[PDB]
Design an enzyme around this catalytic site. Structure first.
Site, mmCIF file in Angstrom:
data_model
loop_
_atom_site.group_PDB
_atom_site.id
_atom_site.type_symbol
_atom_site.label_atom_id
_atom_site.label_comp_id
_atom_site.label_asym_id
_atom_site.label_seq_id
_atom_site.Cartn_x
_atom_site.Cartn_y
_atom_site.Cartn_z
ATOM 1 N N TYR C 155 1.099 -1.122 -0.273
ATOM 2 C CA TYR C 155 0.140 0.126 0.170
ATOM 3 C C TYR C 155 0.841 1.255 -0.153
ATOM 4 O O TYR C 155 1.395 1.754 1.053
ATOM 5 C CB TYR C 155 -1.217 0.235 1.359
ATOM 6 C CG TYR C 155 -1.909 -1.805 0.739
ATOM 7 C CD1 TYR C 155 -3.181 -0.878 -0.078
ATOM 8 C CD2 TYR C 155 -1.605 -2.270 1.487
ATOM 9 C CE1 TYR C 155 -3.729 -2.877 -0.139
ATOM 10 C CE2 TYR C 155 -2.908 -3.952 1.610
ATOM 11 C CZ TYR C 155 -3.357 -3.466 0.500
ATOM 12 O OH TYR C 155 -4.317 -4.394 0.247
ATOM 13 N N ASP C 203 -1.503 -5.917 10.717
ATOM 14 C CA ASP C 203 -1.435 -5.125 11.165
ATOM 15 C C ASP C 203 -2.420 -3.420 10.540
ATOM 16 O O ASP C 203 -1.652 -3.485 9.326
ATOM 17 C CB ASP C 203 0.690 -4.465 11.502
ATOM 18 C CG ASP C 203 0.453 -3.086 12.175
ATOM 19 O OD1 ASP C 203 -0.072 -2.117 11.917
ATOM 20 O OD2 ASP C 203 2.178 -3.058 12.099
ATOM 21 N N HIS C 205 -1.899 -0.472 11.041
ATOM 22 C CA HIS C 205 -0.690 0.460 10.908
ATOM 23 C C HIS C 205 -1.343 2.326 10.546
ATOM 24 O O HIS C 205 -1.473 2.500 9.958
ATOM 25 C CB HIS C 205 -0.248 -0.096 9.566
ATOM 26 C CG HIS C 205 1.746 0.688 9.834
ATOM 27 N ND1 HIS C 205 1.636 2.225 10.090
ATOM 28 C CD2 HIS C 205 2.423 0.014 10.490
ATOM 29 C CE1 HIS C 205 2.657 2.771 9.044
ATOM 30 N NE2 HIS C 205 3.358 1.575 9.877
ATOM 31 N N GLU C 229 -3.276 -5.012 14.715
ATOM 32 C CA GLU C 229 -2.925 -4.064 15.813
ATOM 33 C C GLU C 229 -3.165 -2.163 14.937
ATOM 34 O O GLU C 229 -3.143 -2.821 13.320
ATOM 35 C CB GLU C 229 -0.931 -4.355 15.103
ATOM 36 C CG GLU C 229 -0.656 -3.771 15.573
ATOM 37 C CD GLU C 229 1.098 -3.935 15.296
ATOM 38 O OE1 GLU C 229 1.392 -5.357 14.844
ATOM 39 O OE2 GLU C 229 1.986 -3.415 15.047
ATOM 40 N N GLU C 255 2.315 1.408 19.532
ATOM 41 C CA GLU C 255 3.855 1.814 18.733
ATOM 42 C C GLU C 255 4.803 2.817 18.754
ATOM 43 O O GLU C 255 5.716 3.189 19.082
ATOM 44 C CB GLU C 255 4.615 0.786 17.846
ATOM 45 C CG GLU C 255 3.925 0.988 16.281
ATOM 46 C CD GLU C 255 4.144 0.464 14.576
ATOM 47 O OE1 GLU C 255 3.984 -0.584 15.320
ATOM 48 O OE2 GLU C 255 4.261 0.987 14.218
ATOM 49 N N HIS C 305 7.178 -2.984 20.461
ATOM 50 C CA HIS C 305 7.356 -3.360 19.057
ATOM 51 C C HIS C 305 8.719 -3.942 18.693
ATOM 52 O O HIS C 305 9.905 -3.126 20.046
ATOM 53 C CB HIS C 305 7.108 -1.300 18.910
ATOM 54 C CG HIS C 305 7.613 -1.210 17.112
ATOM 55 N ND1 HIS C 305 8.090 -0.481 16.807
ATOM 56 C CD2 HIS C 305 6.855 -2.023 16.129
ATOM 57 C CE1 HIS C 305 7.560 -0.472 15.468
ATOM 58 N NE2 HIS C 305 7.056 -0.929 15.566
ATOM 59 N N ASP C 309 13.889 -1.669 12.255
ATOM 60 C CA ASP C 309 15.015 -0.463 12.543
ATOM 61 C C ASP C 309 14.851 -0.310 14.230
ATOM 62 O O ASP C 309 13.751 0.862 14.975
ATOM 63 C CB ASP C 309 14.143 0.836 12.786
ATOM 64 C CG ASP C 309 12.871 1.212 12.284
ATOM 65 O OD1 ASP C 309 11.966 0.113 12.216
ATOM 66 O OD2 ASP C 309 12.443 2.055 13.144
ATOM 67 N N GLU C 332 8.406 -10.000 18.742
ATOM 68 C CA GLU C 332 8.130 -10.251 17.317
ATOM 69 C C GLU C 332 8.899 -9.962 16.799
ATOM 70 O O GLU C 332 10.418 -9.618 17.198
ATOM 71 C CB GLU C 332 7.065 -8.198 17.068
ATOM 72 C CG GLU C 332 7.306 -8.288 14.646
ATOM 73 C CD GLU C 332 7.025 -6.160 15.491
ATOM 74 O OE1 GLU C 332 6.840 -5.653 16.317
ATOM 75 O OE2 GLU C 332 7.595 -6.094 13.585
HETATM 76 MG MG LIG Z 1 3.111 -2.009 13.463
#
Ligand SMILES: [Mg+2]
Ligand SMILES: [Cl-]
Ligand SMILES: [Cl-]
Ligand SMILES: [Cl-]
Ligand SMILES: [Cl-]
Ligand SMILES: [Cl-]
Ligand SMILES: [Cl-]
Ligand SMILES: [Cl-]
Ligand SMILES: [Mg+2]
Ligand SMILES: [Mg+2]
Ligand SMILES: [Mg+2]
Ligand SMILES: [Mg+2]
Ligand SMILES: [Mg+2]
Lengths: 397, 397, 397, 397, 397
Positions: C155, C203, C205, C229, C255, C305, C309, C332
């Site tokens: 997406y 997720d 998001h 999530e 997160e 989370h 990164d 995760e």
């Molecule tokens: Mg997430």
């Protein structure tokens, strides 16, 4: 379209404080200036502007301030907080500055115009003695101020008259009970000498625990302060319900806010009478207007934070907001010194207790970039933020 | 792993109270000591440790205090309550002692270290006359205390100046109105004589009905007590909303708690300013840390119950928690007599109104097993718990 | 005491992401390492550490992590937010690292030990086709994973199949309805092929408006996802009440959080089932432990989370928290590549669906400082954060 | 200053509806045009403008729109309501037109500029048969619309297939059960034929009692309407909680609102997903901006009422608001006929499902005064407002 | 059936105020009279009646007042508000007059008869000096009044002793602090001179901000006013909770109401003790009865607004409602002048502090059509509605 051609961030310390200005240049040749002043961490704000907002913004259309604000706010994914918000505020104010200049209108006229002639102003009197307070209060009254934030005593530094543990941890010490006692005595004495001559304000500056705040509200409510400011820290404002349920005291809070979750329940539940947000901490003019309107629906009034650690550009912006927003109440003011005035020419000063909005095109105050270079950033420890209670505990400063 | 090799429970009565210590031995050779003191039912706690916790724990890894605590709490299916929690507390504290000793750290350093230099301390003054009170207060002030819990009059015993029924049922009698009248007068007298020289605390000890508690709060709020403790019994704390909505009085509560349902709504609704839990009654250090954190999010501060019916080991543990948890406020003073000092060597005493955490490895206080054997359990009836009002009815003691 | 002798901040990009490590040196010669990774603004975090935390911290006692955290958090007066919190997190983790090393214990043992043997792990499968999803799901299942976050479709990017306005503003475009439709179809197909073979996570998001989230919850609840999530952005979580009142769907969120006001009402009102905070965004281990305990009282479970990164140091820290905190649920995980493994040696990897905490002293993972120098910071635009709906509107990314 | 020199109100009926325009002249020579359209009582609005607003406003400074609005709203003491607000709206909009013209900017650029490229548009399909519906839907889809408000059947008029009392009182009759049955069937049929090809909207137009509304929401929620509009009358919106607690249906409401008390609790409690206010009914642009901001804080989006009984000037204003306010969602389609186009030249029309804001100075649409005179006010009885149920009772129309 | 044959609307100004009467003629030959007085906008009300209610109503059965009201209220679709409601009220009252005339009964006998012998009355005393107040008060007590609304000072006009901005915007200026100060002193002096001789009322008339209202409530509660009226504007009545939780003051509010959403929550939450609605502003007798009943269930009492700007017809109606409705409390009265008495013959006047309902058929008071012609409508600017604070801001008047 008006394409952004450059973004610059300058830190200047003409006097006591590291001030931060953002400058936006556009292909029209019209230049904007904004305030991004987070005085305690200026290099972080500059890094944020130079390394991130600049390459993001160059090439984009400066006309669409609203999209640019919404885009900027979410651009690092994680968001809110003082470093990002001040950087965005700098750009946001400069973009409004450009729009007003291009419209050839004072900023507040863009907003929809005045809803008052000028904004009332309060100033600050602080002394370790009542006699010293009287001296300052007397001068202010003679100058036409009708509102004065008064404080008796200075709080911090070495614990000279405080019973600490044997080897107290390094910090800035005060005693909450001494502070409460001095403050109540101050109000009692000021009302005895001055009666209802002027409006007395006082800044609790989050010094107290919740039980102390509730006691203090009941102790000073009879003196009808114009407001008692920051009676609790941002994380404990639910405790305001205890105060609102049993005290008539007028309350102001919020200079510390940089996340909307800090103020929404606060305002919806009418927990304060005045919101005190620092405009650059909440991300600039764009969110200030929205928050102004939000408060208005709930009957909450506005007193934006206006400390010395803010550019005169930021102050002029607040005056434009204050003469426009119908629920704006009062503007905080501290005198500018000559260096600051040289770096930021034409800064308005209160006249007979009033600040008048600028009537030229734009914000009305810019930064002289050569003058600003004479005063580079200078590291400051800000030792007062390491605030400790007698037992050596940190307390919100 | 550090396999548990033995579990022992010792009841010892060096002075006025039956004290309970749990001793955990491990294969590493490191021994832990913990407090399991429920003084009114000590043989029941010892049965619980010796007959149930011992065969459960022997062979398991002492390192994993958290698993062991979660496992111990639900091991009998039915749970919570004073007998089980105290037995578990003794084990839990000893396991923390062991972990700190192996880490070669004072207990509070394990937790994450200090958030204050030392904890302020309040002492207790009780007398049947004001002059007797003044006598004790003057002595304490001269010793450096800044907080004193004061009580005028003794309440209980034969109904000498009390209009009871003809043949009053056997019990320990008091009149709530006499108690309120004396306490209000006491506060009045202390403020007249001492002004704001020290912080005055008072323990209502669940003596009152809710309408009496509300009346009393309004009667003494003007005297700004540091806290009014146990103004209601645990089962009636929703009545505190009536108080919180109309009074500024500072409140402490919770020494009686041994089930989380007793405190959650209390803290969530900000019904008190200080939590007063007895650490061993809630199951030890492990839940005390969680509860401290829980309270901290709601702005509630901590004043763990520190009565004489608690081992010096338990007191040391509380001082470790008190110098660590940022929202810890004050620790109750317990003067230790010679016999108790011999049984529990090196117990800290307040110095100029402060208790300092131990700085050696572990909790810092152990029990001398030979000395403790000299002072075996002795039955006490604790007649004061059969507390009766003038009509002969039981009231919560 | 253990005096801090140096503070360093290193940005390294061994693979796809700019990672940020803080290194604390002490007079004991014991060195700590922590994660300060805010990948989108790494130079700002480095500035914050080098220019401000360093001169503040040098000379202070590293043992007192709690005071140092409370002091650091308020040191700039204004506070919270991603830049300050990550900088403080870096120091906080390194200080815990030093404490564990000095104690000669794995970090989780300092906390009080394990409450589980190891933490369950979920991984990520994403494809533009169901066949591609099956390929990844099949591999994961073969490797012993029992939980997989699945996504059908990518997406963002150019609006190839989206009806925008004539000249769409530059950005990363998606259509919420296409996204909803693909996601429901994905769940339907996965349940048809795999039944209850594994736990499916997804997720959202923050892609959706509140009305879309409520619809979506009712559309997928029959598929019993392990969790859905970030179904809403942080500023709209009051809308979760609408969902909790009519849907059984399991929800995870957070997160994005870096201000406690974002999670308190969330948890108190049981609006989510799992909290997803990024430990470095909330200020490190110190607040993570407290937030863990806060959640526990309300029966909310933890899934910190753990994105690419973040340093492997940060991941090992999360595994220590996950095996300790009783209400930790799942970790995760995404695979490390060889450069990252070279810069951060000994990073644990999941074994048969489980991550095992490190058993050596300290956090258990450090940064190789020579290796890190091979991979200097590299500017990344992160174009996906300029997320736009078909009409050109910004949406929370 | 820009002194107001004249105020005029013109009622014009180019096609089916009496439209109302306010014209404000200033000494600068700049003329503003605004919408004051309350079509059912146009002579009352004109009396209000001509007899009261005109002598009030002449001589005052048009620049200060905010003061003028606050002053106008309370000028009659009693306030709010459709006649006063519409007259004020006409003035308010014209003042914004003037300010934008002087700034030489499109209206939305004054506000702060765009937050989207253009606004999506929904059109209306209504027929007494499904095939007639399909006919209109096919045409609209082919024109690029992605949102269509559909309605099967016409409701009102003589009670032809309705069991009324013997001699039914004169009125416009319908049966709520027939209406519900047809609408459910319509949704079912459209999803079978078109699937997810377009967004289906439906306007309940306050036809139902609360128990009917709740039943209907559960009956159509599965069809995922983009919104169900006016499912209850303004006086019964607390009944929406019953719907929100058990249904996912998307809701819009508010075209009838002319008092802030009608919307505050609505929005605060998230009772709808879209606000539908008629901008002139709430008093113009000035309150529309505040309300948009108010809604944005609660996550509520905007779909201002855009019926044919509104000037093209009002439509243009709404498109200016829609491309500016970030939480604006969609604009209702009004096809303009030749006569209306002549009276109001240059009215925008949707292009491929989008309405684009005007880009010239000011609102961008004016009224041709000569053309408007050709089409004078004509009395209409609007018989549909005498809406009756089968027993002959009035229901909200 | 009793067919309506004509509707007329007459504006007459026999004394200081434009008064509005509706006249309904029926085929029976029975004529009814009603009050539609909105004095600030009379020509808009007359347009409403003449151009819209007249062609709607002629031909319909006057017997069915309930249907006619429900029908009229929704007839313009958009609804509520002062212009429409007043028009409808004039009709509604005349219909009730017609029905009572046909029944050959006093209006209140139609309702179900008396629940009291007569209604108590309060008058207005206002002066710029205390002795001026005393003379008026003394006059009223001698006449038998037991309730007097008292006001010290006049508020508005030129800002003579007010510190405004340099060139204050044209308006009617007052200073809130000056007003509070004078009003508190007035109460103090009145209780000193008169003690409990009479009931003192005071009308705040929405002059204050919420924090000022709360302060004022606490300042005057000790003087036990019969009621303090309009302590807040209608849009801010949720702030009344703050007052009701801490003050015992008796409150009245509501003369401004013209939308039921303004009163429902007010009454449901017991925010006032007396509702003050203007009967013609809420739509006449029909809704006055229902509102009376709604208040009664909640224990709220009624003091309908009875200002000089109302016909004696409307005043008579209120006395009928007041002798009938059990929860009616008191009737405000201002003395009639002779020209008004000529135009509206036989208006009752207070007798020894009581107003007695008319005992002839109908309302009991009509308009002399020939006399009313001697006094046509005359424009008035009502300059007091442009009420400004010292800084130039509009405040609710
Ligand atoms: Mg997430
Ligand atoms: Cl400094
Ligand atoms: Cl302290
Ligand atoms: Cl005993
Ligand atoms: Cl990138
Ligand atoms: Cl869109
Ligand atoms: Cl018609
Ligand atoms: Cl109206
Ligand atoms: Mg301040
Ligand atoms: Mg006690
Ligand atoms: Mg509609
Ligand atoms: Mg009044
Ligand atoms: Mg109260």
């Amino acid at each position: 379209k008006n394409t952004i051609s450059n973004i610059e961030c300058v830190i200047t310390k003409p006097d006591r404080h590291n001030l931060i200005t953002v400058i936006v240049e556009t292909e029209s040749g019209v230049t904007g200036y904004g305030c991004a002043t987070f005085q305690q961490r200026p290099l972080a704000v500059k890094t944020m502007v130079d390394e991130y907002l600049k390459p993001l913004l160059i090439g984009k259309d400066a006309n669409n301030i609203e999209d640019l604000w919404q885009m900027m706010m979410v651009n690092a994914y994680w968001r809110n907080g003082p470093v990002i918000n001040n950087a965005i505020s700098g750009v946001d104010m400069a973009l409004w500055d450009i729009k007003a200049k291009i419209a050839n209108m004072p900023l507040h006229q863009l907003f929809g115009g005045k809803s008052r002639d000028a904004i009332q102003v309060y100033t600050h009197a602080t002394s370790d003695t009542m006699e010293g307070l009287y001296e300052q209060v007397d001068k202010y009254l003679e100058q036409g101020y009708q509102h004065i934030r008064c404080q008796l005593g200075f709080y911090g530094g070495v614990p000279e008259n405080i019973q600490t543990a044997q080897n107290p941890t390094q910090g800035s010490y005060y005693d909450q009970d001494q502070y409460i006692e001095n403050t109540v005595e101050m109000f009692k004495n000021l009302r005895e000498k001055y009666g209802k001559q002027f409006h007395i304000l006082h800044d609790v500056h989050e010094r107290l625990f919740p039980n102390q705040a509730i006691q203090f509200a009941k102790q000073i409510e009879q003196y009808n302060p114009f407001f008692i400011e920051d009676i609790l820290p941002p994380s404990q404002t639910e405790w305001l319900d205890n105060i609102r349920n049993q005290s008539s005291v007028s309350l102001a809070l919020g200079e510390l806010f940089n996340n909307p979750e800090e103020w929404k329940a606060l305002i919806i539940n009418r927990r304060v009478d005045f919101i005190r947000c620092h405009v650059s901490q909440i991300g600039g003019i764009t969110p200030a207007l929205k928050l102004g309107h939000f408060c208005e629906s709930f009957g909450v009034r506005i007193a934006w934070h206006c400390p010395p650690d803010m550019t005169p550009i930021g102050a002029a912006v607040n005056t434009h907001l204050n003469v426009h927003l119908h629920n704006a109440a009062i503007q905080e003011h501290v005198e500018y010194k000559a260096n600051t005035q040289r770096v930021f020419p034409n800064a308005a000063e209160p006249i007979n207790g009033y600040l008048y909005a600028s009537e030229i095109a734009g914000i009305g105050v810019e930064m002289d970039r050569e003058a600003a270079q004479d005063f580079p950033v200078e590291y400051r420890p800000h030792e007062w933020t390491q605030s400790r209670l007698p037992d050596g505990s940190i307390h919100t400063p």
